[PDB]
Ligand binder design. Structure first.
Ligand SMILES: [Mg+2]
Ligand SMILES: [Zn+2]
Ligand SMILES: [Zn+2]
Ligand SMILES: [Zn+2]
Lengths: 1343, 50, 72, 43, 72
């Protein structure tokens, strides 16, 4: 209907154009009749009638007079709702500066006039006079003239001298300023002023100037002269009870402006002295500031309430403002709430709606269906009938309710499974009954949560409910595709109890024809629920052309596993229920049923699992008692043993052998080891009971103790709480982080005495405070990630890129923490993946790697798969459907129009709230496996004694078996003592490297004589005389206490011939001298026989939490950034200690401008003659992420972040598919800086949206001209969200005044195109089912 | 080492820094600074400790 | 999750993190150094019987603790 | 220059207390209106 | 109807399914039609998915039928 929203500056003629009159009196109403006045603040001639189609006078009160204007009071007969939209104006008697355009911090008026803010705020409050086109009378235009200076400079000059003060001065400055004339002269001086600050200020001003000409606004419109008043229905005067009233504070601010303008009108009618009119104009200007923004000038004036008033800026800006609190967070008809109960008779797709709530919610539906069937004639008759709730309106309502979903929603809606649609089943009572499987998807328990239920009215929203939001359509977690409808606690106790064997149960060793015979035997009481029998099992396998090949065998199972086999569908084997079936086993069983059979049999299977689990958990009779906590009998001995140990260390601290700090450390360690001992004793006492038998002998078995049966099944809780029940409680913490050294030797099956109970409350109170403080900040990160990723929607089917990250699992040292089948599943192959024979294509290209393909490439032992990633997608304002991958909440490939930015924001935020809200930090190589060693950067030398020491820098270790995949991955030190040779497959149990951090040698390449030239002790070395053996040591110094005669000069480690001829470098015509950085332990002599690789100069020696994923996305610069090798080439040092060392990497074929200001406190990894390429390590520690993007590719900060963020998630144990961090990163670094502006239409120092760069460079290379190159920039997720395109969207999460002033002066437009834009505006989103509507409207524009 | 930084050395210039910490800008008179300070911690009508 | 189970996870993270941060400061296995690393004093043999790997003596470590009591 | 060191110290540590601004105000200004205008300027 | 799985695979897109079934349910509810699949006392938006399930309503079949309704 409007298609775009355009912002500008209001013309004074336009302000009078909106107006329907002028407000002249500050009266609001009549005070007696409560009537609107003749020309007051709540006027009726201006804004309209108080009653619908009725004059204020009373004459033309008839509905026949609609549209006429009465002659007695001047009102127009219209609706009274027209005074919701009618403005008036206030013609101010003096001009007055808009405080939005002055006291903004860029201060558009100040930046425009080429005068600082102190200038204009001095002139505006009547201090200084200002020259406006001052002729040629010895002056400067735009100059401050203070009052006495203006007076004595008016002397000797009969010219009228053109010096005003106040907003008349600034208005005549803004009018007489030609913008384009100044643009041409500014570009003229820009032709001749290539400096840094000068050119920076000139282009910085010329940006706002070129925007101001191309916008169409006038600079004199920033100085206000006529003031718009709001409609009276937006600052109402509602009559409350008892004669009392209630107004808005804008009434007081408009009353202040009307008062001061009327009084200034009189004071300029009266030819008053100038000081009181100066004070009146300054007061009226202050009143306009308090009206438009009460507090940007200072201070925010309070009325008869001691809070500040809410102004117009405060009515758009703020948490309670219309932009935040009323454009999205808004109450909703056809909605209600009540508490949740279980009611597990339900299916997965129904909720239990109460009957009074369904009578209330579905009222117009009931009326239409009740009068369509004609049991009432009038809608008044329908109203009286269903108010009476007769015996027929329940039949009509259960007809209405049949297939009509209700959106059940619980309040902390962290992700999209907080809203699901359920078919309503009418129950009595007043509580919503809710299927027990989805309680883990809402995080909704039954200690009194209430679920809000909405109704979808339209057929489009009914079908959106049924097709997306039905609880059976969403059974995979959208974070990682595992099922979220995992059976949680009673179902897993039932499924664990029926399927866990007993050694001698009733009915042992029988042979049954199948599960029917097993249920018949159990239900008649002839066999126990778990007795090892031989059941005949028909298990179907679709290991053919979707066949379901059947096969019947004779399995060795228990009775209850056979009974549970009946609810299994066909495609699953029997070995999935032939086990204990704890919690993870039911998760894997439902996952197997989904991966094999699809969506519907998983829903029927999960329902039958829930029914069977509740039923056999009921028939379990699984109680809990006081004899289900068996206290270990050795607990007294371990407690007495630890008390004897801490008595001994108390003695040896009384003897002064150890201090109190080590004594506290020793007793903490002793009591913690004793607590582990007691827990081990009780956990071994609990998990093995003695049962007897088929033959009457003693036979251990896993105990049926109900507390062990709850802990081991994964029903509720784990062995730590069983430690606090039977074993000892342990050492208790403190809010200081410290540990109370007197532990709690008691437990909860015994009691706690008063001291231990007072000790426990520090840790428990700190835990509950941190819980209840975290829930007040639940989705702050989800909000901060939907701001950055609002407008990312899948728009393309296949953009067709060839790039992408190449995915390899996390082998950190030994094991692999997360394999390849976790990552490469669901992603799209960016290339053709060949076999390890490098001969045949395994998966072609553009393929959805499902579990069959990933099973195939894991059978083929493939290791280096290049997936299609989101950060390398070739489409604009969106991703393609293949560069994302698959949906993960459905298992299919993604659809066109899924809002994956919001989905990934939620799938980082909702698993992210399971992380800790406070942060927490925590010889020879252990060679275990055998195989072949692979080395990259491998340049090793032989030694004489057979050992090896590697002289290349980054030769890190890779062990391969005969499978292709990496086995042992480690960093080899620079010259550690290897027993590893080269390439030869070794056996495990033999050290490959004997490292020592005291050992970093400068081991030679060739053998020879290390004679020393340019070597003077005293100004280059220290006098090191090792009395230890009596050796000649020359340990070189830093730039600390040597002379400056040998500071820049370096001592030579020159290895020469037996005669003394300078041996060459193999490959390089330079000499053999290895000049040394600081602190090298040298044992050498001039002329000693040493071999190649001799130890000449040895050098001496995981955070978790939600704040880490806060700081990983904000992309902080760490205080110890590991500096890099900025450019490829061999290295040299630089200037010694002007505060910092320099270091000139010199490329052998390129220029070397980089002598980097390296502090001497961060010691070199490298030697100063050691060739390192670009993107290579210099310092040691946390690598800064911006340096990864500048130096290495965009797949190296993509691989850095989504491995560093997942190192926080996998540390706690929370799994998440790494699509979700990649669409946030893809929206993070969508800024490029220009460096070669070329024939492209951008400046040099220009940061712009990258996908506008990549399309101009697409088109300006599509001509016969050449396009720009760009250096990618990466920003924080509070700063990437700042540079949005929209201004309606940007004013909802950023500060509105700085946004709306920046938007107005640019004359900006908003073609809407965004999720938050159209949600505010009231249209369909451009994401979901409203993508095609934004096709249907982007069809009609290319008409 | 806090005497090694302390620019004042006797009580007349000591009340100067105290009066210019309380009320800046004004020239500290020899009675105006001292009558502010002695009434600040040692007089019942300003410094009440219960 | 009953609002006193997330309390339980926070409290167990507190106790386990603090106790591991203490037990990492026990320096269990080491070398018999026989001489302190800031004084060169002979560390008595019962002290190495208590702690294997004390590079500091008793009272120089006591001075280290007293210096580290505040920070810096 | 002292208020410039206040700007640099605030952006160098990420926060400002009342003690740090009150130690980095000049010597010439007295009353509390202008100094909390300066607090808004830095705020 | 419980799940729209056959319906979303018979169209190929989940949101255009919602739009097509919404158009068909509008024709069946207020447009004036008859159900193509027999309605087993279903609401109007379940008949639309059971017409999409049997291949009887897609976008082009609905559009050529709109052509035929204009043809008279
Ligand atoms: Mg609860
Ligand atoms: Zn009238
Ligand atoms: Zn793509
Ligand atoms: Zn010592």
């Amino acid at each position: 209907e409007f298609d775009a929203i355009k912002i500008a500056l209001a013309s004074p003629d336009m302000i009078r154009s909106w107006s329907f009159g002028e407000v002249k009196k500050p009266e609001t109403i009549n005070y007696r009749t409560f009537k609107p006045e003749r020309d007051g603040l709540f006027c009726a001639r201006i804004f309209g009638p108080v009653k619908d189609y009725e004059c204020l006078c009373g004459k033309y009160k008839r509905l026949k007079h609609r549209g006429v204007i009465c002659e007695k009071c001047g009102v127009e007969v219209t609706q009274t709702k027209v005074r919701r939209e009618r403005m008036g104006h206030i013609e101010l008697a003096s001009p007055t500066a808009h405080i939005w355009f002055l006291k903004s911090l860029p201060s558009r008026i100040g930046l425009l006039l080429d005068m600082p803010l102190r200038d204009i705020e001095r002139v505006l409050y009547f201090e200084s006079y200002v020259v406006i086109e001052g002729g040629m009378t010895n002056l400067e235009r735009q100059q401050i003239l203070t009052e006495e200076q203006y007076l004595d400079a008016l002397e000797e000059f009969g010219d009228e001298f053109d010096a005003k003060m106040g907003a008349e001065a600034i208005q005549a400055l803004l009018k007489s300023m030609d913008l384009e004339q100044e643009c041409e002269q500014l570009r003229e001086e820009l032709n001749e002023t290539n400096s840094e600050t000068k050119r920076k200020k000139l282009t910085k001003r010329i940006k706002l100037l070129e925007a101001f000409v191309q916008s169409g606004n006038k600079p004199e419109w920033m100085i206000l002269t006529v003031l718009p008043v709001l409609p009276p229905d937006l600052r109402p005067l509602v009559p409350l009870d008892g004669g009392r009233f209630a107004t808005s504070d804008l009434n007081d601010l408009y009353r202040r402006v009307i008062n001061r303008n009327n009084r200034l009108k009189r004071l300029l009618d009266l030819a008053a002295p100038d000081i009181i009119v100066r004070n009146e104009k300054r007061m009226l200007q202050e009143a306009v500031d308090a009206l438009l923004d009460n507090g940007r000038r200072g201070r925010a004036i309070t009325g008869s309430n001691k809070r500040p008033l809410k102004s117009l800026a405060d009515m758009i800006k703020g948490k309670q403002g219309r932009f935040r609190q009323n454009l999205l967070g808004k109450r909703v008809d056809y909605s209600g709430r009540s508490v949740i109960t279980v009611g597990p008779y339900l299916r997965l797709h129904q909720c239990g709606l109460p009957k009074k709530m369904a009578l209330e919610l579905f009222k117009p539906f009931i009326y239409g269906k009740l009068e369509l069937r004609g049991l009432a004639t009038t809608i008044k008759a329908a109203k009286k009938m269903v108010e009476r709730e007769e015996a027929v309106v329940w039949d009509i309502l259960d007809e209405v309710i049949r297939e009509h979903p209700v959106l059940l929603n619980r309040a902390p809606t962290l992700h999209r499974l907080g809203i699901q649609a359920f078919e309503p089943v009418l129950i009595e009572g007043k509580a919503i009954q809710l299927h027990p499987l989805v309680c883990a998807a809402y995080n909704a328990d039954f200690d009194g949560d209430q679920m809000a239920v909405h109704v979808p009215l339209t057929l489009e929203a009914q079908l959106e409910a049924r097709a997306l939001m039905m609880s059976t359509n969403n059974i995979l977690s959208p974070a990682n595709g595992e099922p979220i409808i995992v059976p949680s606690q009673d179902v897993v106790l039932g499924l664990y109890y029926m399927t866990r064997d007993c050694v001698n149960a009733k009915g042992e060793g029988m042979v049954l024809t199948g599960p029917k015979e097993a249920e018949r035997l159990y239900r008649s009481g002839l066999a126990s629920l778990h007795a090892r029998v031989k059941v005949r099992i028909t298990e179907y396998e679709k290991d053919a052309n979707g066949e379901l090949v059947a096969k019947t065998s004779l399995k060795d199972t228990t009775v209850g596993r056979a009974i549970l086999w009946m609810i299994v569908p066909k495609g699953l084997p029997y070995s999935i229920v032939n086990q204990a079936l704890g919690k993870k086993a039911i998760s894997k069983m439902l996952n197997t049923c989904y991966r094999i059979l699809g969506l519907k049999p998983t829903v029927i299977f999960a329902d039958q699992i829930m029914y069977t689990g509740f039923a056999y958990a009921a028939r379990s009779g699984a109680s809990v008692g006081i004899d289900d906590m068996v206290i270990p009998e050795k607990k007294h001995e371990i407690i007495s043993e630890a008390e004897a140990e801490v008595a001994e260390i108390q003695e040896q601290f009384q003897s002064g052998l150890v201090t109190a700090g080590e004594r506290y450390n020793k007793v903490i360690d002793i009591w913690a080891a004793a607590n582990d001992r007691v827990s081990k004793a009780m956990m071994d006492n609990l998990q093995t009971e003695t049962v007897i038998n088929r033959d009457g002998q003693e036979e251990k078995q896993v105990s049926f103790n109900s507390i062990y049966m709850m802990a081991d099944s994964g029903a509720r809780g784990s062995a730590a709480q069983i430690r606090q029940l039977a074993g000892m409680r342990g050492l208790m913490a403190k809010p200081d982080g410290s540990i109370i050294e007197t532990p709690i030797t008691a437990n909860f099956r015994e009691g706690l005495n008063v001291l231990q109970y007072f000790i426990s409350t520090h840790g428990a109170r700190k835990g509950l405070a941190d819980t209840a403080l975290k829930t007040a900040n639940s989705g702050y990160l989800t909000r901060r990630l939907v701001d950055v990723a609002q407008d990312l929607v899948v728009t393309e089917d296949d953009c067709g890129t060839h790039e992408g990250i190449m995915m390899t699992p996390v082998i950190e040292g030994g094991d692999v923490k997360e394999p390849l089948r976790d990552r490469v599943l669901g992603r799209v192959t960016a290339e053709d993946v060949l076999k390890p024979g490098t001969a045949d294509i395994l998966v072609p290209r553009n393929t959805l790697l499902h579990e069959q393909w990933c099973d195939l490439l894991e059978e083929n032992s493939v290791d280096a798969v290049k997936v299609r990633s989101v950060v390398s997608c070739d489409t604009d304002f969106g991703v393609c459907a293949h560069c994302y991958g698959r949906d993960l909440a459905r298992g299919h490939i993604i659809n066109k129009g899924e809002a994956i930015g919001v989905i990934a924001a939620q799938s980082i935020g909702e698993p992210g709230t399971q992380l800790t809200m406070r942060t927490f930090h925590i010889s020879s190589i252990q060679v275990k496996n055998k195989g072949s060693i692979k080395l990259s950067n491998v340049k090793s030398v032989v030694n004489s004694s057979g050992k090896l020491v590697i002289t290349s820098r980054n030769t890190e270790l890779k062990l391969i078996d005969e499978f292709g995949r990496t086995k042992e991955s480690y960093k080899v030190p620079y010259g550690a003592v290897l027993a590893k040779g080269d390439g030869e497959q070794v056996a495990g149990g033999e050290t490959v490297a004997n490292w020592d951090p005291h050992t970093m040698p400068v081991i030679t390449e060739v053998s020879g004589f290390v004679r020393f030239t340019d070597m003077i002790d005293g100004q280059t070395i220290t006098r090191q005389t090792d009395e230890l053996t009596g050796l000649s040591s020359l340990v070189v110094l830093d730039s600390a206490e040597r002379t400056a005669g040998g500071k820049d000069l370096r001592p030579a480690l020159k290895i020469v011939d037996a005669q003394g001829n300078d041996v060459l470098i193999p490959g390089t015509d330079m000499p053999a001298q290895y000049f040394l950085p600081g602190k090298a332990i040298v044992q050498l002599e001039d002329g000693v026989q040493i071999s190649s690789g001799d130890t000449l100069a040895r050098i001496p020696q995981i955070t978790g939490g939600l704040p880490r994923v806060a700081d990983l996305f904000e992309a902080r610069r760490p205080k110890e950034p590991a500096i890099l090798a900025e450019i490829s080439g061999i290295v040299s040092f630089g200037k010694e200690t002007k505060g910092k060392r320099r270091l000139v990497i010199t490329p052998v074929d390129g220029s070397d401008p980089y002598e980097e200001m390296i502090p001497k406190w961060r010691q070199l990894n490298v030697f100063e003659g050691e060739r390192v390429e670009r993107g290579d390590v210099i310092s040691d520690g946390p690598e800064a992420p911006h340096d990864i993007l500048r130096l290495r590719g965009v797949h190296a900060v993509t691989r850095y972040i989504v491995n560093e963020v997942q190192d926080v998630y996998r540390l706690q144990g929370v799994k998440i598919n790494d699509k979700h961090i990649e669409v946030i990163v893809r929206q993070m670094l969508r800024k490029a800086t220009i460096v070669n502006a070329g024939s492209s239409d951008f400046l040099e120092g220009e940061q712009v949206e990258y996908s506008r760069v990549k399309i101009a460079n697409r088109e300006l290379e599509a001509n016969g001209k050449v396009g720009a190159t760009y250096s990618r920039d990466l920003l924080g997720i509070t700063k990437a969200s700042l540079a949005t395109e929209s201004f309606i969207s940007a004013a909802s999460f950023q500060e509105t005044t700085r946004v709306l002033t920046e938007a107005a002066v640019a004359g900006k437009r908003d073609e809407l195109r965004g999720l938050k834009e159209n949600v505010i505006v009231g249209r369909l989103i451009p994401a979901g089912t409203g993508y095609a509507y934004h096709q249907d409207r982007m069809r009609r524009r290319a008409a | 080492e806090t005497l090694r930084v302390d620019p004042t050395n006797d009580r007349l210039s000591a009340l100067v820094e105290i009066y210019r910490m309380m009320r800046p800008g004004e020239p500290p008179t020899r009675e105006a600074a001292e009558s502010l300070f002695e009434n600040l911690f040692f007089s019942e009508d300003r410094y009440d400790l219960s | 999750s009953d609002e006193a189970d997330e309390a339980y996870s926070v409290t167990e993270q507190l106790t386990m993190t603090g106790i591991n941060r203490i037990r990492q400061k026990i320096n269990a296995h080491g070398i018999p150094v026989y001489l302190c690393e800031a004084c060169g004093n002979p560390i008595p043999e019962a002290r190495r019987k208590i702690f294997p790997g004390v590079t500091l003596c008793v009272e120089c470590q006591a001075y280290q603790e007293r210096q580290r009591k505040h920070y810096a | 220059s002292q208020l410039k060191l206040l700007v640099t110290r605030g952006k160098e540590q990420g926060y400002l207390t009342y003690a740090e601004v009150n130690d980095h105000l000049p010597e010439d200004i007295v009353d509390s209106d202008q100094i909390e205008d300066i607090i808004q300027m830095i705020n | 109807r419980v799940t729209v799985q056959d319906a979303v695979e018979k169209i190929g897109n989940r949101f255009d399914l919602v739009l097509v079934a919404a158009r068909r349910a509008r024709q069946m509810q207020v447009g004036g039609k008859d159900p193509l699949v027999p309605e087993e006392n279903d609401k109007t938006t379940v008949i639309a998915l059971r017409e999409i399930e049997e291949g009887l309503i897609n976008n082009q079949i609905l559009d050529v039928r709109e052509r035929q309704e204009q043809q008279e």
